[PDB]
Design a protein around this ligand. Sequence first.
Ligand SMILES: *[C@@H]1O[C@H](CO)[C@@H](O[C@@H]2O[C@H](CO)[C@@H](O[C@@H]3O[C@H](CO[C@H]4O[C@H](CO)[C@@H](O)[C@H](O)[C@@H]4O)[C@@H](O)[C@H](O[C@H]4O[C@H](CO)[C@@H](O)[C@H](O)[C@@H]4O)[C@@H]3O)[C@H](O)[C@H]2NC(C)=O)[C@H](O)[C@H]1NC(C)=O
Ligand SMILES: *[C@@H]1O[C@H](CO)[C@@H](O[C@@H]2O[C@H](CO)[C@@H](O[C@@H]3O[C@H](CO[C@H]4O[C@H](CO)[C@@H](O)[C@H](O)[C@@H]4O)[C@@H](O)[C@H](O[C@H]4O[C@H](CO)[C@@H](O)[C@H](O)[C@@H]4O)[C@@H]3O)[C@H](O)[C@H]2NC(C)=O)[C@H](O)[C@H]1NC(C)=O
Ligand SMILES: *[C@@H]1O[C@H](CO)[C@@H](O[C@@H]2O[C@H](CO)[C@@H](O[C@@H]3O[C@H](CO)[C@@H](O)[C@H](O)[C@@H]3O)[C@H](O)[C@H]2NC(C)=O)[C@H](O)[C@H]1NC(C)=O
Ligand SMILES: *[C@@H]1O[C@H](CO)[C@@H](O[C@@H]2O[C@H](CO)[C@@H](O)[C@H](O)[C@H]2NC(C)=O)[C@H](O)[C@H]1NC(C)=O
Ligand SMILES: *[C@H]1O[C@H](CO)[C@H](O)[C@H](O)[C@H]1NC(C)=O
Lengths: 651, 697, 290
Amino acid sequence: KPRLLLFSPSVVHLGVPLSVGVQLQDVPRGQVVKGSVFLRNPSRNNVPCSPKVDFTLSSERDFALLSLQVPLKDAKSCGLHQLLRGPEVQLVAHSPWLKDSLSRTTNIQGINLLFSSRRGHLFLQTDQPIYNPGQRVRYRVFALDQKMRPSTDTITVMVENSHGLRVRKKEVYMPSSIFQDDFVIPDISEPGTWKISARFSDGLESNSSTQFEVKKYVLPNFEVKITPGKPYILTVPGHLDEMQLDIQARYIYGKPVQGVAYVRFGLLDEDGKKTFFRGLESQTKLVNGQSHISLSKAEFQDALEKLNMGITDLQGLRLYVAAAIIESPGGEMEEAELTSWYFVSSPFSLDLSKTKRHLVPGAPFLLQALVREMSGSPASGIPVKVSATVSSPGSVPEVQDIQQNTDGSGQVSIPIIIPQTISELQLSVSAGSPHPAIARLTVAAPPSGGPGFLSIERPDSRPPRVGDTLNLNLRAVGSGATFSHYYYMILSRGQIVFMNREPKRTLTSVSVFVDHHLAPSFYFVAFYYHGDHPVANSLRVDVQAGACEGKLELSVDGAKQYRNGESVKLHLETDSLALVALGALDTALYAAGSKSHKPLNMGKVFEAMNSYDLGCGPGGGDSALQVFQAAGLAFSDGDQWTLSRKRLSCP
Amino acid sequence: PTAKRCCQDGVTRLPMMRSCEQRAARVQQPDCREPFLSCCQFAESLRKKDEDDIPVRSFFPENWLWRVETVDRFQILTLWLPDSLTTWEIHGLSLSKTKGLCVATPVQLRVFREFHLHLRLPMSVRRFEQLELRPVLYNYLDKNLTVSVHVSPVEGLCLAGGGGLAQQVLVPAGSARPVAFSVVPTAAAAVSLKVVARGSFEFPVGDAVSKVLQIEKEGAIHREELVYELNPLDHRGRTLEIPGNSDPNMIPDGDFNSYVRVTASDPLDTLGSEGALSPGGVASLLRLPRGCGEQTMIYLAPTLAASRYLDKTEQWSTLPPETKDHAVDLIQKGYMRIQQFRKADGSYAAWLSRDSSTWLTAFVLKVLSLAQEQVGGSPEKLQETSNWLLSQQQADGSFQDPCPVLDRSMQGGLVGNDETVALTAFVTIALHHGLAVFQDEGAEPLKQRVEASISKANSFLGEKASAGLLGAHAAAITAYALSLTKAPVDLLGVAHNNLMAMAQETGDNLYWGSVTGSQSNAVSPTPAPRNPSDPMPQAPALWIETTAYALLHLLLHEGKAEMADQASAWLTRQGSFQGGFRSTQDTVIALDALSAYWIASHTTEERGLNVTLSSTGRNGFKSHALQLNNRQIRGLEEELQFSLGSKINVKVGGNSKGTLKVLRTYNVLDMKNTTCQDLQIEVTVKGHVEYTMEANE
Amino acid sequence: APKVVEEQESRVHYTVCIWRNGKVGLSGMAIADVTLLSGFHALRADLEKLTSLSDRYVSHFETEGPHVLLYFDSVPTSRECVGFEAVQEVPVGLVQPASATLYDYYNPERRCSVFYGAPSKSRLLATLCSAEVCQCAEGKCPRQRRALERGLQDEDGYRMKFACYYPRVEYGFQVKVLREDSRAAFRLFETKITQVLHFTKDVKAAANQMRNFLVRASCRLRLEPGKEYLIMGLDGATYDLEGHPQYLLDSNSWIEEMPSERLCRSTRQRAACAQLNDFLQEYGTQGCQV
Ligand SMILES: *[C@@H]1O[C@H](CO)[C@@H](O[C@@H]2O[C@H](CO)[C@@H](O[C@@H]3O[C@H](CO[C@H]4O[C@H](CO)[C@@H](O)[C@H](O)[C@@H]4O)[C@@H](O)[C@H](O[C@H]4O[C@H](CO)[C@@H](O)[C@H](O)[C@@H]4O)[C@@H]3O)[C@H](O)[C@H]2NC(C)=O)[C@H](O)[C@H]1NC(C)=O
Ligand SMILES: *[C@@H]1O[C@H](CO)[C@@H](O[C@@H]2O[C@H](CO)[C@@H](O[C@@H]3O[C@H](CO[C@H]4O[C@H](CO)[C@@H](O)[C@H](O)[C@@H]4O)[C@@H](O)[C@H](O[C@H]4O[C@H](CO)[C@@H](O)[C@H](O)[C@@H]4O)[C@@H]3O)[C@H](O)[C@H]2NC(C)=O)[C@H](O)[C@H]1NC(C)=O
Ligand SMILES: *[C@@H]1O[C@H](CO)[C@@H](O[C@@H]2O[C@H](CO)[C@@H](O[C@@H]3O[C@H](CO)[C@@H](O)[C@H](O)[C@@H]3O)[C@H](O)[C@H]2NC(C)=O)[C@H](O)[C@H]1NC(C)=O
Ligand SMILES: *[C@@H]1O[C@H](CO)[C@@H](O[C@@H]2O[C@H](CO)[C@@H](O)[C@H](O)[C@H]2NC(C)=O)[C@H](O)[C@H]1NC(C)=O
Ligand SMILES: *[C@H]1O[C@H](CO)[C@H](O)[C@H](O)[C@H]1NC(C)=O
């Protein structure tokens, strides 16, 4: 049956063009249809909330990807906007052809889309992350649009203090797309976390924020550092004997501290909740400003009985060391604390987030694992063994045993061959030869009915870099037969980037050039129609490359000194004219490990521009409507609908 | 609970020697005193011979090169680093119109110099005190270093051998040693001490440290300032002679300067770029510290009072364009400074986490309501503030304050009636300004309640004003409050004529203050013997506050006329030398009063003043001829200095009235006997070990 | 085994007490402005315990330069004391007194200002110097010499040479000392003029009048009470309580004890005592080369 397919992202962003896709299906060879697509309000009477763009599809020119701009004045004109958050808007495609030819109920067909006023990217940073009352705090705000280019729109910036009182408001033009300001933290201020927020003036919902902590002036005579021998303690009953630590203390000007250091041991839990041994404490005279401490198993057992073995076991806890050191000459005591000493099942840990939860009978299934060591880095080079048990009805339950070494970003992608008749896949993964980092998963089979399956085949399992070309194989699977073309489209961030049509071959291959429009991750969605039922599948491709679109490299060159100080040259190298914002920070504040207030890095901005990703899960599922809304699309053909998203966050 | 903090405070040491019984007398809270006392008693005798957060280091040097650079293909920056204590992380991010944003990977930079010199100076030294400098030599190498160290010569300091003497110091490997240089300052100035270290033959290594040492004159500083009335329309005041200083406690060594400043443009001097809208504001002009909550209003209300004058008289053009930026910068600073004091229910406390004050809550409501003129759009928080203020109104119609910020009346017996009326009239003024915050169509119950609260309070003020036992201060606020809120005319009239019946007048001046009965035995019924050749006697802060309220009341009651002219003339000649008045409260109210008068009495015509000053000082005979006018902003720019001990002779002409004031500042050897009458203070230093031995028994 | 020892960073303890002499109920906020002794700085750790503990004494404090400011909610009517600790980073010696002032904040007319100094018999009052810098610091001090004391370079007419040649003198008296009493960083002597020789600014000077002479606390000089001195120098700029000029002893001032009849009649000084009287008569009547 001839029909019109309407595609669009799940949510609408005000001030951001919505890329809507139209596709004409099953029409006679000489047929030509023209129409118009626009947004309209269902909350009031159906007034258009946007301009209307026209389209024309032939049977041999059957698809078009259209940019629908949604401005503020028309959203205000259709009575939609302001304080109330998360309304729903209709995107309708209009043509006489639905009534004139198909004899449907009305001309229009459409889908309900969630409406958000958030737009653009706003980054903001302070000249220091921690302050004392009386200090001057300088901050700057960067403004960019959806396509990650500097924006000239005006912004509204506000500061709120420890108790949430709006204390400074400033609204500025942005001719340079960067804003700089300064203020002085009052000398009588209470200690606590202040917050700076900034949003586009007409955005309302587009706010981003950074925060800093002001607290009392503390500058000690000497710094104290606690360093465990292993930053983790294995909780395996066969090996609990690691715990040992080094103590170190030295002046700001370098002189080692001679005194007596007292370390007291305990246990820490979720969200703090201190508890410690009242009968165990170890003291040592410092030598070379250092000391080396160990904890015996018998002392640990005696302390565990003193605490009556707590709740159950130590797996969820972390070893807690509080250090008090008092210098012998001065007689002044200084304090330190170590709060990162977790009891671990294994130093390595498995993550199976990128593994799809849906099988395709007769097509391979990719187990994709991430192994990260402690809390510091992804583990590169560690073997990962996979045991996959196929459950097939009334037949042999075959098992597949295969291992692979992590490389690059610490990832392993292992193909598992799925037979044409399956009930489920029982999966168990083991990482690391000496210690057992384990994970398990069970993937259920799709129903025996349905219109068929589509396999989007990934031959090169390695994560692409920006500049690589990824090859994807499309093959209809199993029951399906007698169809013409494959239809596919690319989704990156919040919009459809590209949409195309592929004629079938014995092996149908599609090549995607991974440029900077697809960073940091994109979805490949493909589908074909079996009569009046769509068959669809998808996969998410995480681009594993932190490289900039441009480039900024810092390098300190030759130096020279006449002894009032020392001079050195700093080189700023980049590609194309750019505004380079600089800043120099003392490493001492981050060396201790206090707070997660890292400065802006390339991983965070990639995470920030990926906040507009509407997809949920790593790949589509059993039904085509599930596949499309898992990818992040709204879809309607006049016969099947996709329900509007009730929350911007994933379920 | 708070009992944990009270027990922790009980075991914490105190600098003073305090046993637990007298120490627990200060807490004044029963559910805190019981754990505080028991934990103190535990620590007092039974104990012989952290719990929450940890003390992570919080002071870090400011972010140098916090800047943006326009970078093309590449750019080269030269950095200068004195010997770095810690490693720097140099960060950077790029924003380009063509290729988007890029965050650069950081580069580490440290200067770990082999030989490092560390000089430390005292904050300030008085001349002919002796000090032994101990610059510390740091050797970070794995070997010994023998360096030749010397302190550079400089005049005014007694260096050893004039500064050419050098000492050979062996600094061991990986350690530090000081080298002692004794020096005696003989002249009071800011001198630059430069310590130089150079390796003698062994290694060509060196370092140098230069720091400025402040040498001050002996004794303690003393300050006296006096105001002279310049009027050529009166032929008696066309010439006057200013006598020199002859204080018997003055320090002998060193000549001192008497500073004078003359003006014929008092409003621009007071509220212009040289005065209230200086980049430091009136806060910089006042001598007082400004830590407390009330003092923060000196950033806003004088700045607002200056803005209203310049806005409504239309002469922002006569001030530099930096002035408008100064005003909004001061208002933002003051608004941020006070909002830390706001409590959850909308009240304001004198100090952080202290009890609420009805007076301060009213004061903040009054000023921040005026602040909506150019920093508006915040009605909710001011509506909360006034709604809390309504809850402090008693059945009498008056308001109660459990912890008042400002006590001022000295009329015994009636002091409680004065303070209750003064507080009530002050809250009424604040509530009246609160009406202008919300011109909203809705939220009228608050508008109706504050209108009803003002009417009940005005009836209370009317009874006490008609009874006529009030002091001068209470009647001053009451007369303004009744005129401001447009109280019944019968109440308005009795308060006005009761206020005027307490006025004191002399020459061209009208003022209020301390008029319980007949205050002098030689005066005529209304004037007094004072002529322009005599100085204007400086009045206490109470008199300036009362006269400012009376002047504000006169502007609402009549507008211009002689009574406002004579009252404002006295106020403009009570201001301190460098701007502002006695303290914060009298300054803010007087600047509001003078601003309202200056807007009403402004004229576009130009009147001038010619002043010729002359004196014979240490620099000989000097004379200055200045012609001034009403349109000429002036101030600190043209201070004129003469020798303190020599008299100044001035002659004045023109067609306008002006003001001359003189500043005498000098150090003293004794504190005379005109102080330590009402209040007392004694300060002693006992030595650390001697006090430790007295405490440890 | 025994050691002679002097420590770096000497430390002292402060005690500040305030009270209201009046019986009136008026209190109000007041500020104690204590100017520290030279080189010292107050410990912020001890100051915070005064304000931030449950047994609060001081309401708030500010350390600004050598000043320690203490905010008080009210001034008690009974003597109430607050103390803290202060240390000296860079050793300053010969420390001279400093001042402190307690004043009503909103009525600064009400105030009490006092001088306070280092504790006697402590290293703060003592010197610390090499011989050269202490000799350099004494160069400005007055010319203290004994009765009829003559130096190597005195040229047998030295008193007349001092008065009329170099450095030339502007006043000249012969006085008897009554007492000395201390001032802040100074010492002043109450003297009675036995005989007037020459004057310039002090026009109404005459014999048997009182007059005050001041010398710095650092200097060697002190005029002993109950003795007679011939002192002559340059006019100053200060006056005493009753309006008479005060005089400053520096390197341009001549200071000589007057000899007794026993010293004059002794064979050693019979000629020197005659030369002094001959100078006294010529300078007292004729003046400088008339
Ligand atoms: C870099 O700077 C450092 C610090 O100044 C120098 O360190 C010194 O090194 C010497 C050795 O080179 C040490 O010498 C030892 O001195 C002890 C104390 O002696 C004192 O009294 C004698 C006179 O009686 C003085 O000459 C001396 O300077 C001290 O003031 C002696 O007791 C030692 O002798 C004992 O041990 C030796 C071991 O070999 C035996 O043979 C002897 O018989 C005897 O039992 C010894 O002589 C000296 O102590 C170090 N100084 C300090 C403060 O500890 C480095 O020398 C210098 N680098 C260079 C290259 O010079
Ligand atoms: C507490 O502190 C106060 C202020 O510092 C001190 O007060 C001073 O006291 C002395 C001694 O009584 C005063 O000196 C006397 O002043 C009288 C008033 O003179 C006024 O008028 C003349 C011009 O005619 C001005 O120069 C002067 O400053 C005053 O304004 C004179 O009448 C006195 O003179 C008599 O004695 C002298 C003695 O030499 C005779 O020659 C005269 O002919 C006449 O008989 C005398 O000069 C001084 O004026 C007071 N200061 C002030 C500012 O007034 C207190 O002394 C002090 N308390 C204690 C206990 O010391
Ligand atoms: C952009 O601004 C909005 C608000 O304008 C932020 O949404 C707020 O997020 C917080 C945290 O999840 C929500 O929790 C509540 O916050 C309030 C303070 O706003 C606090 O008092 C509560 O205890 C609770 O923690 C808050 O409800 C929510 N605001 C609304 C209206 O729902 C948003 O987080 C900002 N964007 C970013 C990136 O931070
Ligand atoms: C004193 O100030 C007045 C202005 O207030 C000056 O007035 C001028 O005086 C001269 C004669 O000295 C006249 O020719 C001018 O016409 C006057 N100006 C005006 C505008 O009328 C006066 O010059 C000043 N005195 C001196 C000595 O300069
Ligand atoms: C003059 O002073 C007397 C003081 O009793 C009166 O207050 C009188 O009212 C004053 N004159 C004027 C016009 O107020």
